[PDB]
Symmetry: C2
Subunit: 346 residues, 2 copies
């Protein structure tokens, strides 16, 4: 079933329930996921109204871009030309600049396919918005089906050569309570290398490093606490994890990550080359989620995209988008129960 | 009473009915007026869903900007520097460029004051959007009261020196049917001068012309047909009226214009210096409103703003907006019914 209601400030809340009774909800403010529940438990972080996003933290569950992550000094080179983008984090351009796409009301249409329901959100980034050449016609389709798969499909076309590398900013917390650390979750991730950050400004260091057999090696499932407890320089730099992980094998067919807590698992599939993992390293900020004060490490993202820093590390990829060329990206989060035996204590 | 409903594509329709039983409706799509009706008759032109506006004509009833009207060559000078804005009508920038603020979903909040209800729409125009320096945080408040006054109050703040001169693009048609010309309405307008257009591109000619004792003098109420049957080359040029008229006396307290048909009249008040009057000179286009085929002359605007063309005729005014200055503008359309 599909239900809709005002969510505040003129945004709407679109709630879907599949045949298995799992419910998931989205808002056109930022073409964002608001909630995902199984048996009355929140599997992700979200707020109860649009205003909360605008006043507390506008990134959770949002579609972010046109470029996700940090761009050093807001500088990109487009078809031999240098362009300077809005700089919203010091000299850095973070998630497309200030008042970016995650803050706008997108228009949308819902398509009921029966075993699958699609919510296609649309928005036009005008030419020159935040320094980006355009215009860019974007669309984000979120869909949920009877097999418990939540899929995100991105599409975009630009009138001018530009750059495009958006992502979905959901935060998982299988505890269903923001005040509970995700250190008790087990994580498996098919990546042998990561991108280190230069310093507290979080721009990339410039090298790619092998993490096999370190506390950041999750090729084989391990508790997140192993990482959180680590004193590796990179962990200490950010007080948790806030880095791009380079997938070892590409392809939408491969389970690239799996996050488990007791009998519940979330599997990640994508056609993108990397996954930026940020573990809500907010310290004592304590943003309130459903009246629960969020704890340091009270959430984790799986931002699938071309890794940030390609400006400095060309090997990471090319996010340029030629005029008239159609961009597409697909990311899938799937829910499972009793996928494996995960019985731990923290 | 206030009623909010889905208007299509995620847009909302906010309808306000006052003590008098008069209903006005707006949508966040373009911070726009959709309908205005009395005793079941529409006073303005509008569609029945968000999609229609996007497919048929996105201007009707919308908030247009950041700059309303045509800018020659899309060129403006900001702090001695040339800036080229998005060009969407040949080399001109018309109504802020393509996919402008009238096509966006603005956020909004409703405030019920009892005799008066306000709907405050907000939108951020990012720095560089369509070539305009920013960011510009904008808000447009449409309000309706028990005195049948529909008011529009604009506010803006920019992080950088820029240009700003929006307008409301409602089209009136007291016939209540788009298939009927407005030639039968009577118009009164407190302006003795107008801004002639250069040619069919509709850019300004360069001069200011006295209209006293011409077919365009409405200082004294007269029927539209007059203007419409005039042989003045300017009328002939556009096949109707599509011009900025310069108001003789500035100030919000002066009734600047009045549109009348039978017992029903609309009065216009504004703090702006000019009123752009466009008479829906669409020829055979036949756009459909409520299933009625629009006729050439099937509507008329009162766009209050600084006259277009100030880029070439500085006397007209200056639309610049300095960083950190607060822009404000107010326009009111008041509805009256003679108890005959
Ligand atoms: O809160 C926004 C969040 O976005 C991503 O997760 C970044 O990597 C984090 O450093 C942080 O900036
Ligand atoms: O439909 C848009 C309309 O906008 C204004 O009123 C112009 O002056 C008209 O020439 C026309 O372009
Ligand atoms: Na809506």
């Amino acid at each position: 079933s599909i239900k809709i209601r005002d969510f505040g400030l003129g945004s709407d809340l679109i709630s879907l329930t599949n045949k298995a009774g799992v419910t998931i909800s989205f808002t056109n403010l930022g073409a964002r996921i608001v909630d995902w529940q199984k048996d009355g438990k929140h599997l992700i972080l979200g707020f109860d109204s649009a205003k909360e996003y605008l006043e507390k933290d506008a990134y959770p569950g949002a579609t972010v871009g046109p470029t996700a992550g940090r761009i050093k000094d807001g500088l990109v080179k487009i078809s031999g030309k240098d362009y300077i983008l809005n700089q919203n984090e010091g000299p850095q351009t973070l998630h497309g600049g200030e008042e970016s796409i995650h803050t706008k009301l997108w228009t949308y249409e819902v398509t009921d396919l029966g075993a699958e329901v699609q919510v296609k959100f649309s928005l036009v980034s005008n030419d020159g918005t935040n320094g980006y050449p355009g215009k860019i016609e974007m669309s984000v389709t979120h869909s949920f089906d009877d097999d418990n798969k939540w899929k995100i499909h991105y599409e975009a076309i630009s009138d001018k050569d530009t750059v495009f590398n958006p992502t979905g900013h959901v935060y998982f917390n299988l505890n269903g309570d923001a005040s509970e650390s995700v250190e008790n979750h087990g994580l498996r991730l098919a990546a042998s290398r990561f991108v280190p950050l230069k310093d507290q400004t979080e721009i990339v260091r410039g090298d790619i490093v092998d993490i096999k057999n370190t506390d950041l090696d999750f090729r084989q499932e391990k508790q997140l606490s192993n990482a959180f407890n680590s004193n590796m320089e990179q962990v200490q730099l950010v007080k948790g994890i806030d880095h791009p992980f380079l997938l070892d094998q590409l392809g939408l067919d491969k389970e690239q990550a799996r996050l488990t807590l007791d009998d519940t698992s979330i599997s990640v599939f994508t056609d993108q080359p990397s996954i930026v993992i940020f573990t809500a390293n907010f310290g004592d900020l304590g943003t309130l989620y459903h009246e629960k004060k969020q704890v340091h490490h009270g959430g984790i993202t799986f931002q699938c995209q071309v890794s940030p820093g390609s400006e400095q590390i060309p090997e990471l990829g090319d996010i340029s988008l030629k005029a008239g060329e159609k961009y597409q990206a697909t990311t899938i989060y799937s829910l499972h129960t009793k996928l494996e035996h995960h019985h731990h204590h923290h």
